[PDB]
Design a protein around this nucleic acid. Structure first.
Ligand SMILES: [K+]
Ligand SMILES: [K+]
Ligand SMILES: [K+]
Ligand SMILES: [K+]
Ligand SMILES: [K+]
Ligand SMILES: [Mg+2]
Ligand SMILES: [Mg+2]
Ligand SMILES: [Mg+2]
Ligand SMILES: [Mg+2]
Ligand SMILES: [Mg+2]
Ligand SMILES: [Mg+2]
Ligand SMILES: [Mg+2]
Ligand SMILES: [Mg+2]
Ligand SMILES: [Mg+2]
Ligand SMILES: [Mg+2]
Ligand SMILES: [Mg+2]
Ligand SMILES: [Mg+2]
Ligand code: NA
Ligand code: NA
Ligand code: NA
Ligand code: NA
Ligand code: NA
Ligand code: NA
Ligand code: NA
Ligand code: NA
Ligand code: NA
Lengths: 57, 178, 59, 140, 72
RNA sequence: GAUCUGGUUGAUUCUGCCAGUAGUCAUAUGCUUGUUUCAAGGACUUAGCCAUGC
RNA sequence: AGCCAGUGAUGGCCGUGUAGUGGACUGCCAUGGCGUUGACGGGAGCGGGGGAUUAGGGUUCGAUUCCGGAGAGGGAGCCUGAGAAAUAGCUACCACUUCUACGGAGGGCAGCAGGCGCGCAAAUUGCCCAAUGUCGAAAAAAUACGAUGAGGCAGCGAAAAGAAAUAGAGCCGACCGUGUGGUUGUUUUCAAUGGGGGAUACUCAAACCCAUUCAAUAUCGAGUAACAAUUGGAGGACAAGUCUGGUGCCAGCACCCGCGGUAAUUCCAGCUCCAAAAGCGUAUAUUAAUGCUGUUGCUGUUAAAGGGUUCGUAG
């Protein structure tokens, strides 16, 4: 809040850790430090996709 | 580019740029309310013109008209609550008699000086911009704030300010570190 | 002909500007003017004020 | 007086359409002949090349030389005469340079005591002639 | 509704529609008209200058789109 | 905000146009620019020509 | 001022093609259809929802985010699909064009970002599927991550729009006017605050900007506030000098009237002042000024303007 000592946010409570892992979005788990590692840059993935359009098998 | 925000204009320059009578009347208003530029006066001109224009249209309408009753009550509710018109005047015809200083009387820079928290009309603006005034325990730092009728007694210093119950200010802190 | 162009601007002697304290700006400027003409002078009920009156020197 | 019909809107519409061609202001905006004769194809400014520097005399009550230049436009290769303002300011022009030319005011009418000149020089070598005059910039 | 204008065709007539158009600027009217060709069955027998009522149909020709009911 | 002013005569009262004046999510150019919020951005001329990647 | 008919123009009759009606089309028959209430031809132009200006009536703009239509260098044909006469589908011709071993093979940015040219004139060869949606044999989770320059996010950006700093209180002399009360510099304290910089950190899909905060034992900082406001003007219209030097119908100003020929209220400068201010000049177009396009609401004896006189049809 402007010029004050107040702050407002949203909150979720899950019944157990198993349900939290299943439903929580990945970037929110990564904030804690326990999400999936990483994926390669999107540019390279679409680069190979067109390259493999010239070849069979 | 595919946006749907809105915006508009709030003031308007006057025709006849140099009339000695209008030049002096406006200068008198500025140096006595401590305004920064003539645009602040010309804002009040248009907001005044809008209430006058809608009152004129309503007054032309016959009494008991459904549009007249609903809008007529609404404009008086706003005018009374904001402090433009005293509670005895209620006929909707006292709207047109509103003048510029009547609106400029409700400005937060003015009301701070009237309550005596400041030693002048320019001292009060400095205080407002430097986060010292709280209206309803909420810090307000915009001189053009128009004080409602139900909020004059709640105006006071802010807790976070050094003049309130806050920490010592910049001069004290740098003197201690000296 | 075009032989004489810019003759006067090249003939006038050079003179440098003076050094002065900066005037107040913003809301402080409008405050200065309001006391410059509406206060600080007791000419009342005459309205005979001249914003820029020069010393008599008409030779 | 005139026609007062309640069923005579056709006559009143025809009258206004025919009689609207009689004012030079309204006719100039609906006729397309002005744009063709105007060296700027209906544009605020135009770019050209300096051909030579000329000096034109002033009209009768006055007496001076007005220091113009002859400019050939680029977009359509038309030749015009333009006036270079302010004291000096001819030494900043030179020959074969490239200039930006604007109107003089009055929208094609000649201005002042200069006979038949309706254009002024604004930029020379894309720097700005007034900026050069005030020494805020140096010629490239 | 309209006024029968021409009956030179075979099993076909032309009807004229007269109306008035209002121009906002001059607060006045002006006569207009439109011509419409219709099919007329041999049960009826209209002369030029009568009034007819016509109802829509499916395209019966390049231009014909209406049919004649209750000549009067 | 339902407003006008300078130029024809030795002076006057007119018709009448030139010039002044205020805007424009209206374009461009000149000079000058501390903070913040919201924002249009190769239509205008050439539906002209296009390397490379998606 | 006339338009339409060999070779379809307006209608009729059985037919054929289409998904279907139809002159859409074949054969035969009739002579019709449109037009001064402006047809036919020519010019400018994508429609609309809407923007600007606003006593009222109006004038003007609308390529552009929503809806509709059309196109994919130029122009024609067609396969597959329920649906295309599709351009990141195919075939050919016309204009420019790439590689080659000279036998041949290709190319279509008015999609995204970028280059040349054109011009008075317009941004990065960025990140991401987190949100909004479409497609799909798909909910999310694992021994197991759908694509998506549609879309969103940040860089450049005084088109334009909304808030808003560049200082506030006093002290002591010197004063200025007026009649003892604002005031104009000279010395000098005394607080306050943000441009500036840094996180326990918030945001974020990740970074940025806002919003918090200079201890919570425990956290940097204006005083010739060098943290220094500009752009146009001072004869009139139009606010503001009968100031001081230079030039001498020259140089120049001047939107209009005008200024300059030795005392320039107008040029080139210094000093003051005025307007409005992070803004302000100039050019072009357009709206109001304009009762100078007049329906509301003009003028026609002499200023521009009543036909030479009668008859007369549409209106
Ligand atoms: K095609
Ligand atoms: K592009
Ligand atoms: K500053
Ligand atoms: K001067
Ligand atoms: K008239
Ligand atoms: Mg005369
Ligand atoms: Mg283009
Ligand atoms: Mg077009
Ligand atoms: Mg176009
Ligand atoms: Mg569309
Ligand atoms: Mg393409
Ligand atoms: Mg630009
Ligand atoms: Mg001008
Ligand atoms: Mg004189
Ligand atoms: Mg107009
Ligand atoms: Mg007669
Ligand atoms: Mg005759
Ligand atoms: Na309300
Ligand atoms: Na565009
Ligand atoms: Na298409
Ligand atoms: Na192209
Ligand atoms: Na092609
Ligand atoms: Na998505
Ligand atoms: Na976006
Ligand atoms: Na008027
Ligand atoms: Na006459």
């Amino acid at each position: 809040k402007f010029g004050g000592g107040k702050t407002t946010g949203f909150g979720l409570i899950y019944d157990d850790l198993a349900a939290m892992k299943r439903i929580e979005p990945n970037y929110r788990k990564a904030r804690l430090g326990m999400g999936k590692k990483k994926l390669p840059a999107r540019k390279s993935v679409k680069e190979r996709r067109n390259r493999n359009k010239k070849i069979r098998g | 580019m595919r946006n749907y925000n809105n915006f508009n204009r709030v003031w308007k320059a006057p025709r006849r740029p140099f009339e000695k009578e209008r030049l002096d009347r406006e200068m008198k208003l500025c140096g006595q309310y401590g305004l920064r530029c003539k645009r602040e006066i010309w804002r009040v001109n248009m907001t005044l013109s809008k209430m006058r224009r809608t009152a004129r249209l309503l007054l032309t309408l016959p009494e008991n008209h459904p549009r007249r009753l609903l809008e007529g009550s609404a404009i008086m509710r706003r005018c009374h609550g904001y402090g433009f018109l005293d509670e005895d005047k209620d006929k909707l015809d006292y709207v047109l008699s509103l003048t510029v200083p009547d609106i400029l009387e409700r400005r937060l820079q003015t009301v701070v000086f009237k309550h005596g928290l400041a030693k002048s009309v320019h001292h009060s603006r400095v205080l407002i911009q430097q986060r010292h005034i709280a209206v309803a325990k909420q810090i307000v730092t915009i001189p053009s704030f128009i004080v409602r009728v139900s909020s004059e007694h709640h105006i006071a210093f802010a807790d976070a300010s050094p003049f309130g119950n806050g920490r010592p200010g910049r001069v004290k802190r740098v003197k201690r570190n000296a | 002909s075009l032989a004489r162009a810019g003759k006067v601007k090249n003939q006038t002697p050079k003179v440098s500007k003076q050094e002065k304290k900066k005037q107040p700006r913003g809301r402080a400027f409008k405050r200065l003017k309001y006391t410059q003409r509406y206060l600080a002078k007791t000419l009342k009920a005459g309205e005979k004020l001249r914003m820029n009156k020069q010393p008599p020197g008409k030779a | 007086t005139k026609t007062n019909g309640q069923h005579a809107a056709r006559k009143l519409v025809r009258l206004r359409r025919k009689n609207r061609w009689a004012d030079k202001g309204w006719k100039k905006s609906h006729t397309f002949v002005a744009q063709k004769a105007n060296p700027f194809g209906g544009s605020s400014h135009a770019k050209g090349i300096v051909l030579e520097k000329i000096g034109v005399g002033a009209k009768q009550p006055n007496s001076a030389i007005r220091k113009c230049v002859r400019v050939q436009l680029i977009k359509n290769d038309k030749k015009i005469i333009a006036f270079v303002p302010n004291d000096g300011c001819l030494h900043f022009i030179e020959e074969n340079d490239e200039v930006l030319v604007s109107g003089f005011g009055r929208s094609g009418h000649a201005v002042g005591d200069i006979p038949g000149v309706r254009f002024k020089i604004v930029k020379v070598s894309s720097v700005g002639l007034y900026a050069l005059y005030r020494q805020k910039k140096e010629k490239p | 509704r309209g006024v029968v204008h021409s009956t030179k065709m075979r099993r076909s007539i032309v009807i004229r529609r007269n109306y008035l158009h209002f121009i906002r600027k001059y607060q006045r009217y002006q006569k207009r008209h439109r011509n419409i060709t219709v099919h007329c069955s041999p049960c009826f027998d209209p002369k030029p200058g009568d009034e007819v009522v016509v109802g829509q149909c499916r395209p019966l020709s390049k231009t014909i789109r209406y049919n004649v009911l209750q000549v009067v």
